[PDB]
């Protein structure tokens, strides 16, 4: 680990992850029900830290889309956040992966996707990495 500062004088804990994301290497993981709330996602993002919107608290592309729009309206220009999807329920993925692709095509500030409760197969992971157009992929091996 190393220390680094920017022009403003803000100290940063320099790390591989921190070097990539330009923020302190501390993240709040996707938690259903704690991070389902757009207000908490916004408050964490605006504090300067990474957080994942929990897909476990939404049951359709429309509900998650409304939540994402709320988050975007609540954050400052240039901020970003992630989304957490559970790999055990195929319905969640089936409506969520196309939603992420669509929102990223529209340019929505979705930095990364974290897949919880299981690791995708090679083909599914390649599809995610290629089509979703995200900065990085989060995985939670058990």
């Amino acid at each position: 680990p190393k220390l680094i500062k920017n022009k403003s004088g803000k100290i940063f804990v320099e790390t591989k992850f921190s070097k990539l994301i330009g923020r302190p290497p501390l993240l709040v993981p996707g938690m259903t029900p704690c991070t389902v709330s757009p207000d908490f996602v916004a408050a964490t993002t605006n504090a300067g830290y990474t957080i994942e919107l929990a897909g476990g608290g939404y049951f359709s592309a429309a509900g998650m889309t409304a939540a994402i729009d709320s988050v975007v309206s609540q954050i400052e220009k240039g901020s970003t956040f992630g989304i957490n999807l559970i790999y055990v329920n195929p319905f969640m993925l089936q409506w969520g992966i196309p939603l992420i692709k669509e929102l990223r095509s529209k340019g929505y500030p979705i930095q990364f996707l974290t897949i919880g409760a299981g690791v995708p197969s090679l083909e599914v992971a390649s599809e995610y990495i290629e089509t979703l157009g995200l900065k990085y992929l989060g995985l939670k091996p058990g």
Binding site: K5, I11, F17, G22, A47, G48, K77
Partner: protein, 129 residues
């Protein structure tokens, strides 16, 4: 470690990060902030004074953009290496990178490379011969 109720998330995360900063300072920087290196901005790095550059049909895109960006972290670095730019609140492909995408006949002239405040990057292409 969960005891204080209704502590703002800003406070919790800042406390953790500042603890790490203070311990790192005392351990590896002699409790001196002047030892900490400074950059224009922090981020965008993948985990993995006068000059003229010329493109061909085989110029490697990455090396081309690395040469255009330079070594110092500054506005030019971001302009030629940042993958996205920020619209109002959205993220779109960096237009500067696509405008400078190398192809045969493109000649990029960099002037005042060292002084970023006055660096000017000029792209010239064959027009009308």
């Amino acid at each position: 470690f969960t005891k204080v109720i209704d502590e703002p998330i800003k406070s919790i995360m800042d406390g953790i990060h500042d603890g790490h900063i203070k311990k790192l300072l005392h351990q590896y920087y002699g409790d001196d902030e002047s030892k900490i290196p400074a950059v224009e901005y922090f981020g965008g790095e993948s985990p993995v004074d006068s000059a003229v550059f010329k493109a061909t049909s085989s110029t490697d895109e990455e090396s081309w953009f690395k040469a255009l960006a330079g070594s110092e972290i500054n506005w030019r670095h971001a302009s030629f290496l940042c993958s996205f730019i920020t619209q109002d609140k959205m993220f779109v492909s960096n237009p500067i990178r696509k405008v400078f995408k190398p192809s045969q006949g493109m000649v990029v002239e960099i002037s005042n490379g060292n002084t970023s405040s006055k660096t000017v990057v000029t792209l010239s292409e064959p027009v009308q011969g």
